[PDB]
Write a protein that binds this DNA or RNA. Sequence first.
RNA 1: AAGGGGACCAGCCUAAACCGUCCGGCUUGUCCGGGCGGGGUCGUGGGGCCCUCGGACCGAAUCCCCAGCCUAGCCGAAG
Length: 74
Amino acid sequence: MKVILLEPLENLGDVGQVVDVKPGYARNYLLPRGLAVLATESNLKALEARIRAQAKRLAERKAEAERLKEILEN
RNA sequence: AAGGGGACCAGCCUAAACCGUCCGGCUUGUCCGGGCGGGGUCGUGGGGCCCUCGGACCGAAUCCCCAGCCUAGCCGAAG
Ligand SMILES: [Mg+2]
Ligand SMILES: [Mg+2]
Ligand SMILES: [Mg+2]
Ligand SMILES: [Mg+2]
Ligand SMILES: [Mg+2]
Ligand SMILES: [Mg+2]
Ligand SMILES: [Mg+2]
Ligand SMILES: [Mg+2]
Ligand SMILES: [Mg+2]
Ligand SMILES: [Mg+2]
Ligand SMILES: [Mg+2]
């Protein structure tokens, strides 16, 4: 069963990552303890949009600076 | 059971894509979800979206009126 981790988890996987666990594990431990969520299409979308939105504001800072290399350094 | 002969005869509405709107969530949006509206409905496959061209008739199973019908009656020949 595919779930998306909400946290780093000892020898399972890393936050945001999509892993495969026994339905029991997911339903009766992972999900109830907030540690993960079903890899539904609908919240697979969302994880993708977060990966997307983080990657925007990061490469957008690696540009706000690189541009400030141009004001100084000259 | 098909098929043949008959009775009757009638076909429609959606879900999804996509577009819009309100509402809610927290893991802030190019987000996810729920309501509503638009769109769409099919087997020669149909639809959506994007180009090109083209730009009145049909019509209810709903509603309204009416004929007709029912719920009392009445006239009715000649010892
Ligand atoms: Mg048979
Ligand atoms: Mg027959
Ligand atoms: Mg027949
Ligand atoms: Mg008959
Ligand atoms: Mg939705
Ligand atoms: Mg929406
Ligand atoms: Mg909606
Ligand atoms: Mg087609
Ligand atoms: Mg109808
Ligand atoms: Mg009499
Ligand atoms: Mg008499």
